[PDB]
């Protein structure tokens, strides 16, 4: 590769006209409009680009070395929390280390295993999703056991497919290499097609489950509208499924459900966009079970807040909500009254987000609070008294795993240097012996104790103080010499939580680099106001926050000048692409946007773009075009600014941002600064991933070595 050696990219005469509130009609040339299409010409162009990128990476002999180190760092057994089913047996996922899909195991004995003996010594395979297809083209993307433990419902996606299909099997019928060689699959004939974008919710009689589906679509027919919440009865075909709810007048809205443990209530959630606002309707179930013509009580019938059911006791329903409470709280709504009475059960904390609440042991509550972007776990009594903090020395991210009716619960704990701890709380144990560690994840080659994470605060352009995690190998100094990889997402109220990555830690140890995770506005770290601080008309703050983080790393000698690289995916790819356009020349030394939005004027004209109007605004509204257009990366590339080395990565598939965003952005970079001194490249994986499907592990390792090696070489880092 050399500057100016990019594939020829045709420029059309296409112009789109938009209406600006401040400037009236604005004509916007779109010379790469044709990259919106799927054609021979586009295939040759993406092939030329991917060949150019691979040619450049081929010049870098260190990538293969990183692949070896990265594969080894991933090669350690991994496992989930176990779940006790009503058959008395415990089920958990187990991965031998490098398997592409983890395998669902079942305890040999009706007792909690001593997992120190080894998963294969205490459990047998129950469901191995690797055998769904002999060539790995099918993945299990969601599953749910029935409450009585007799059935296992599982959603399957295929390469090339745009929906998932739900299947059902008896829990006494394993799916394994042995079972498929020795006989038929063993599942029921049920085949529930057209499923996507909800969970699977069993009724508590275990007769069936609720799931969202879309209209059947022929190959050359006509978009994803007219979602329906449906009910599937086990042992029937889908033509007998009941439509529980649809709304022809609002064909864009989607649906969720929940069922109360006591069998009394069916709950319906409705969502009109990606804001955290939903309707909440409540139906009473009887002997008649789930039926068409269900009567809904429209308890929450305006879009104003997030409501998610926790549990109920009789007609008193406990709900996690952010109604008038942007850090969230628990309310009760008493349905015994004509006008429901609404009360705070666990009040909002001004400065800590209530992130999750589960009912445990029938009448207790386990709450996770996120304070300064670090999770804290507490146990509450039925009277709302905070009893104890669990795992008080844990620093990182926590989740709860339990079933409300049982006498125990688990916590799953991980963080930058905590690979994966599963703790157990046993209410039947003596009062000082209730909390224990069930399993700790043991990693390979790496020693997590060799790494430190800390949290520092910097100031954004408008004065706002923003926290940022910094992770380093403990021999790395903050003396103005390290490289930094700065990661972000920056949207949709998603929190940039601690997480464990053996590949990142291996990179940090290999090169003496640091990893930086700033909690930029648009995320949900500090509740819904933090999200509102970076969305629609304030979305510019997300970019200012991310740019100020990189400037702070260099100014305060965490990292060397010009040695901050940035990386992010989906919304985080938009973050990366807009950041390199907006920041002063030299702010970044490398950039890897993964599958981002980049045409912020046309994003809502494609597939899943409409739902994002709540996050970015609507380009077709003149007042909103005026704040979108200055931020749109495709429309703000200059000719006078040196760009960092950039490797754009694109994965094709269901539910992913359409790739024309990345295509237009890289075509526009190579048109505007063809002689850039640093390579501006794009790598496309043309396999069509189905919904929820990942790539095989070996491809993931190869892609990681390419990405991190590209960054290392761009920043001048050498293998010691």
């Amino acid at each position: 590769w050399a500057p100016g050696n990019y594939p020829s990219t045709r420029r059309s005469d296409h112009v789109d006209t938009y209406q600006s509130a401040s400037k009236g009609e604005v004509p916007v040339p779109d010379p790469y409009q044709w990259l919106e299409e799927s054609t021979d010409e586009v295939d040759k162009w993406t092939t030329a680009q991917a060949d150019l990128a691979q040619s450049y990476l081929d010049q870098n002999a260190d990538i293969q070395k990183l692949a070896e180190k990265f594969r080894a760092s991933r090669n350690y057994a991994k496992f989930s929390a176990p779940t006790l089913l009503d058959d008395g047996h415990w089920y958990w996922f187990y991965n031998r280390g490098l398997q592409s899909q983890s395998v669902l195991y079942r305890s040999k004995e009706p007792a909690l295993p001593d997992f120190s003996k080894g998963d294969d010594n205490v459990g047998d395979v129950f469901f191995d999703p690797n055998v769904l297809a002999a060539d790995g083209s099918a993945g299990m993307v969601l599953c749910k056991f029935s409450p009585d433990g007799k059935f296992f419902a599982y959603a399957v996606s295929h390469l090339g497919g745009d929906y998932s299909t739900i299947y059902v099997r008896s829990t006494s019928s394993p799916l394994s290499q042995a079972s498929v060689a020795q006989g038929v699959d063993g599942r029921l004939s049920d085949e529930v097609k057209w499923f996507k974008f909800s969970t699977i919710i069993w009724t508590k009689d275990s007769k069936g489950f609720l799931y969202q589906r879309y209209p059947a679509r022929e190959r050359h027919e006509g978009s994803d509208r007219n979602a329906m919440m449906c009910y599937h009865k086990v042992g029937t075909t889908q033509e007998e499924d009941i439509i529980v709810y649809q709304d022809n007048e609002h064909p864009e809205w989607i649906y969720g459900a929940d069922t109360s443990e006591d069998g009394k209530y069916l709950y319906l959630y409705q969502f009109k966009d990606t804001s955290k606002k939903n309707l909440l309707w409540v139906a009473e179930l009887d002997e008649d079970g789930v039926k068409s013509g269900i009567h809904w009580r429209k308890v929450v019938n305006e879009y104003a807040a997030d409501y998610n059911i926790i549990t109920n006791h009789g007609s008193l329903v406990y709900i996690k909500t952010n109604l008038n409470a942007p850090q969230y709280k628990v309310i009760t709504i008493d349905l015994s009254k004509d006008e429901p009475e609404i009360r705070d059960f666990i009040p909002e904390e001004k400065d800590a987000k209530l992130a999750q609440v589960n009912c445990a042991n029938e009448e207790y509550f386990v709450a996770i609070y996120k304070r300064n972007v670090k999770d804290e776990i507490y146990l509450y009594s039925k009277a709302g008294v905070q009893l104890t903090r669990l795992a008080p020395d844990f620093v990182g991210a926590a989740s709860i795993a339990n079933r409300q009716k049982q006498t125990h619960f688990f916590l799953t704990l991980s963080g930058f240097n905590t690979p994966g701890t599963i703790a157990r709380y046993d209410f039947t144990a003596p009062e000082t012996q209730r909390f224990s560690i069930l399993r700790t994840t043991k990693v390979n080659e790496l020693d997590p104790d060799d790494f430190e994470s800390t949290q520092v605060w910097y100031e954004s352009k408008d004065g706002t103080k923003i926290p940022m995690f910094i992770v380093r190998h403990k021999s790395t100094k903050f003396d103005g010499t390290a490289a930094a990889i700065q990661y972000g997402y920056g949207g949709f109220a998603t929190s940039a939580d601690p997480f464990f990555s053996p590949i990142i830690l291996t990179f940090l140890q290999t090169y003496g680099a640091i990893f930086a995770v700033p909690s930029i506005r648009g995320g949900g770290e500090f509740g819904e106001e933090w999200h509102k601080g970076g969305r629609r008309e304030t979305k510019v703050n997300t970019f200012d926050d991310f740019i100020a983080a990189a400037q702070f790393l260099v100014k305060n000698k965490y990292a060397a000048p010009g040695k901050v690289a940035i990386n992010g995916a989906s919304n985080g790819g938009l973050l990366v692409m807009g950041s390199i356009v907006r920041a002063p020349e030299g702010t970044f030394g490398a950039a890897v946007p993964e599958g981002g939005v980049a045409d912020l004027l046309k994003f809502h004209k494609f597939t899943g773009g409409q739902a994002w109007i709540s996050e970015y605004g609507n380009p077709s509204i003149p007042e909103e075009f005026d704040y979108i257009y200055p931020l749109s990366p495709v429309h703000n590339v200059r000719t006078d600014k040196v760009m960092p080395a950039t490797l754009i990565t694109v994965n094709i598939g269901a539910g992913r941002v359409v790739p024309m965003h990345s295509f237009k952005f890289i075509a526009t970079l190579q048109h505007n600064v063809p002689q850039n001194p640093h390579p501006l490249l794009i790598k496309i994986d043309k396999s069509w991933l189905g919904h929820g499907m990942g790539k095989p592990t070996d491809k993931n390792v190869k892609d990681a070595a390419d990405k991190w090696g590209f960054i290392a070489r761009a920043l001048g880092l050498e293998l010691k």
């Binding site: 991994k78 989930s80 599953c143 056991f145 989740s399 795993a401 079933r403 939580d497």
Partner: peptide
């Protein structure tokens, strides 16, 4: 999906399966 493609998800994959 905060870290959905970048890290193995086995640890939390059992939290809500019944």
């Amino acid at each position: 999906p905060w870290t959905a493609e970048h890290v193995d998800q086995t640890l939390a994959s059992g939290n809500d399966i019944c």
